[PDB]
Design a protein around this ligand. Structure first.
Ligand SMILES: C=C(O[C@@H]1C=C(C(=O)O)C=C[C@H]1O)C(=O)O
Ligand SMILES: [Mg+2]
Length: 494
């Protein structure tokens, strides 16, 4: 492929364009027609020294993108993204993509230095408002200045990629697409790109089985935590005095745990993700797997931001109490959350901090509601949606730079929290609690990379979770909460 960060981001490409083929009925037909479209393009090519050409075949059937991805060979990077069902909740910004899978890279974007405005421009060079589905999938480290552990090395400080071949799932139809990207200045010519693409296309599988199985077929040989429970309690104790004494301004710090599971045979991360998706309501599903890397997957409720043209939306998601088995206990826990003066104050400093980030960029911000409880499968959180209008679409980078990270995954004051995390946590968060999603021309959307796992062949998996330590947090209670948060992974692996 080619690293678009190496490109001349101030010089526009020769073209960025989408070509739609006649619709077919099945994925096997789509794969054959797409092979033919790439061939025809090779024989009647564009002649620019740089460009992006997306060729897409509509499929009349509704096919799950994760089922298509499951059928594919290990052609990396592997991408997956499915936005939230957003059931019943208002869309404050007042054909839609249900899921997308990608294999290979038409162009990728990676650096060891933090994602910068120039990097954002480098990606924007490959997108266009008139090609809405040309999108770059990936994310950014929680802390792009932290020490990178080896398991996170392939991800860099950030990793994005336009798929070589992708499957788009819509409400009542689907689409197979392939993307040709090239830049002679980077010694990745149109002929290089077409040749790489034609090899991948002959490897694409149309045996798209509809998956059902609950058994992943792996035995867990051990489970250990970093930190262990014996190291965690003192760490939370240390944070709690910093908060309650008047030497440290700390009011909130999110402290995380890496739960390591060793398996005999390799976990299939796409199969695992597929099982979280059928059981995951109102959540983002994602996979990011750079070449030669473990697969970063997640099923997260939390939006960092969504942008549609000039409208930007984010949310404040903080505090955690468990769900209860009985209806009366569940409601009592919920009312406790909604009425506690302490929780109100702790949630407010999160909501108001995010509100003002948006307020610094948008003319005016809407907050709705001020405070409710968002109920998930095993936990429930306090919650608030915040939306604002950009003056210009190019302010997208400002949104991203202002919001990541919010106090929901880092803390307050940000400076003192971020450095306590650096000193207390002995593992690399990597892209856990980092932005994960995609850039597009007129639309971009990023989840917060929580409720996620790193899945490594020949090893097993790292399962991540954190909790907000605030005045009055109970170490035993928070430890139990970390177990509840990773429970969607630990149950389904069995
Ligand atoms: C840190 C994440 O949880 C986050 C921290 C919130 C809290 O303060 O409890 C709850 C929702 C998330 O924003 C995680 O689940 O790993
Ligand atoms: Mg807490």
């Amino acid at each position: 492929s080619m690293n678009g960060c190496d490109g001349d981001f101030k010089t526009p490409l020769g073209t960025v364009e989408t070509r739609t083929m006649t619709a077919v009925l099945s994925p096997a037909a789509a794969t054959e027609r797409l092979i033919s479209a790439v061939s025809e393009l090779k024989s009647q090519p564009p002649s620019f020294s740089s460009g992006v050409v997306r060729l897409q075949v509509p499929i009349d059937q509704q096919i799950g993108a994760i089922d298509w991805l499951q059928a594919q060979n290990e052609i990396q990077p592997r991408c997956f993204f499915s936005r939230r069902s957003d059931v019943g909740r208002p869309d404050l910004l007042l054909r839609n993509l249900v899921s997308v899978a990608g294999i290979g890279s038409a162009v990728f974007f990676r650096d060891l230095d933090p994602f910068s405005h120039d990097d954002w421009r480098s990606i924007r060079r490959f997108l266009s408002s008139t090609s809405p589905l040309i999108r770059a999938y990936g994310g950014m480290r929680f802390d792009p200045n932290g020490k990178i552990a080896v398991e996170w090395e392939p991800f860099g400080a950030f990793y994005f990629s336009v798929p070589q071949v992708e499957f788009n799932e819509f409400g009542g139809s689907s689409m197979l697409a392939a993307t040709i990207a090239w830049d002679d200045e980077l010694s990745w010519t149109l002929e290089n790109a077409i040749e790489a693409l034609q090899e991948t296309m002959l490897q694409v599988s149309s045996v798209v089985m509809k998956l059902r199985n609950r058994s992943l077929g792996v035995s867990v040989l051990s489970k250990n935590h970093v930190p262990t429970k014996g190291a965690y309690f003192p760490a939370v104790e240390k944070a709690l005095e910093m908060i309650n004494q008047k030497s440290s301004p700390l009011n909130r710090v999110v402290l995380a745990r890496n739960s390591r599971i060793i398996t005999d045979t390799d976990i299939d991360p796409i199969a695992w993700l597929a099982q979280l998706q059928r059981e995951g309501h109102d959540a983002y599903q994602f996979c990011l797997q750079p070449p030669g890397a473990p697969a970063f997957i997640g099923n997260t409720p939390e939006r960092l931001f969504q942008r549609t043209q000039l409208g930007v939306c984010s949310e404040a998601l903080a505090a955690t109490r468990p769900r209860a088995a009985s209806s009366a206990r569940d409601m009592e826990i919920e009312r406790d959350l909604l009425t506690s003066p302490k929780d109100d104050l702790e949630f407010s400093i999160v909501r108001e901090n995010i509100r003002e980030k948006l307020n610094g960029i948008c003319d005016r911000v809407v907050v709705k509601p001020q405070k409710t409880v968002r109920k998930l499968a095993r936990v429930q959180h306090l919650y608030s949606q915040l939306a604002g209008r950009l003056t210009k679409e190019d302010d997208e980078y400002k949104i991203l730079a202002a919001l990541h990270p919010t106090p929901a995954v880092c803390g307050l004051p940000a400076e003192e929290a971020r450095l306590l995390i650096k000193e207390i946590e002995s593992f690399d968060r990597g892209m856990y609690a980092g932005p994960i999603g995609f850039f597009g021309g007129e639309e971009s959307e990023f989840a917060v990379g929580i409720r996620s796992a790193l899945v490594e062949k020949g090893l097993g998996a790292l399962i991540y979770a954190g909790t907000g330590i605030v005045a009055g947090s109970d170490p035993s209670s928070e430890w139990n909460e970390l177990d509840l948060k990773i429970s969607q992974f630990t149950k389904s692996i069995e």
